[PDB]
Design an enzyme around this catalytic site. Structure first.
Site, PDB file in Angstrom:
ATOM      1  N   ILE A  71      31.423  -8.621 -26.223  1.00 56.78           N
ATOM      2  CA  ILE A  71      31.886 -10.002 -26.116  1.00 56.78           C
ATOM      3  C   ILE A  71      33.005 -10.041 -25.074  1.00 56.78           C
ATOM      4  CG2 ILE A  71      33.259 -11.772 -27.286  1.00 56.78           C
ATOM      5  CD1 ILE A  71      31.691 -11.117 -29.807  1.00 56.78           C
ATOM      6  N   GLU A 160      27.501  -6.114 -33.702  1.00 60.16           N
ATOM      7  CA  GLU A 160      27.143  -5.004 -34.599  1.00 60.16           C
ATOM      8  C   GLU A 160      25.890  -5.289 -35.422  1.00 60.16           C
ATOM      9  OE1 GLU A 160      28.287  -2.392 -33.610  1.00 60.16           O
ATOM     10  OE2 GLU A 160      30.407  -2.560 -33.110  1.00 60.16           O
ATOM     11  N   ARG A 163      22.942  -4.743 -33.230  1.00 64.62           N
ATOM     12  CA  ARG A 163      22.680  -3.324 -32.979  1.00 64.62           C
ATOM     13  C   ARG A 163      22.110  -2.560 -34.166  1.00 64.62           C
ATOM     14  NH1 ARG A 163      28.682  -3.091 -30.616  1.00 64.62           N
ATOM     15  NH2 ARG A 163      28.277  -3.482 -28.387  1.00 64.62           N
TER      16      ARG A 163
END
Length: 247
Positions: A71, A160, A163
């Site tokens: 980000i 996260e 991912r």
């Protein structure tokens, strides 16, 4: 661009948001059926926006680098906020160009830098949908003393989860309450680059890692991942950082 609305949010809608996010990222190919992010992309194409709306119908637009899911900053109305680091400064040349006020945050997006600014480590920062809503509100109004914590919540809830299926599942389960992330969850976050590198090495080394990746499992037990047949590789990780971007 992809959007997520907290009002009316459910475990299913959070999953759809994360799927849309993953699918918004371009990939070179798949390794062990996991999308391999691009080595590099030109100018504007390197970034994408996530429009996040809290229960009160207030929205922030978050800028994400599509090659690494990092980000860069966010926009709240006509004020933009970018991390204090090279990558973010470069992103500012391409995103939120017409903001009327451009604020440089007093820290980079590095987990350690953010934790130090927040005065708390990830282990003690609640996650879950209500936490994401609180974070959005804090960022929309830029309450400086709570912004670092809000960003830690935001990063984990977008990048996260994108991912790791495990992380997506944990956060999406908490719809009307919050929870503290386990050491296993944090271990996944800390080892994304390492895992990404080893999986790519394994693809041309008969599934074998060159170097083991040590993780903490659900029972807080330390484990060593050494090949592509591990559950973290076959049933968890959802995006791979390109080896070209790994030192």
């Amino acid at each position: 661009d992809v959007s997520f609305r907290l009002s009316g949010a459910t475990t299913t809608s959070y999953g759809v948001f994360i799927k849309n996010l993953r699918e918004a990222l371009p990939y070179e190919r798949k390794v062990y059926n996991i999308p391999l992010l691009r080595s590099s992309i030109s100018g504007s194409g390197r970034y994408t926006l996530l429009h996040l709306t809290n229960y009160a119908d207030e929205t922030i637009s978050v800028a994400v680098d599509v090659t690494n899911v990092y980000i860069m900053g966010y926009l709240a109305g006509d004020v933009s906020y970018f991390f204090n680091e090279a990558s973010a400064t470069e992103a500012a040349k391409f995103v939120f160009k017409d903001a009327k006020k451009k604020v440089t945050l007093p820290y980079s997006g590095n987990y350690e830098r953010l934790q130090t600014a927040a005065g708390k480590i990830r282990e003690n920062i609640p996650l879950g949908l209500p936490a994401l809503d609180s974070a959005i509100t804090t960022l929309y109004y830029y309450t400086a003393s709570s912004a670092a914590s809000a960003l830690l919540v935001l990063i984990q809830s977008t990048a996260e989860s994108a991912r790791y299926k495990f992380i997506e599942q944990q956060i999406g389960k908490r719809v009307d309450k919050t929870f503290l992330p386990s050491l296993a969850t944090i271990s996944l976050e800390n080892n994304w680059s390492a895992l990404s590198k080893q999986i790519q090495i394994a693809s041309t080394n008969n599934g074998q890692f060159e170097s083991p990746v040590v993780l903490i499992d659900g029972n807080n037990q330390r484990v060593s991942i050494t090949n592509a047949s591990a559950r973290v590789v076959t049933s968890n990780i959802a995006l791979l950082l390109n080896r070209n971007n790994i030192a």
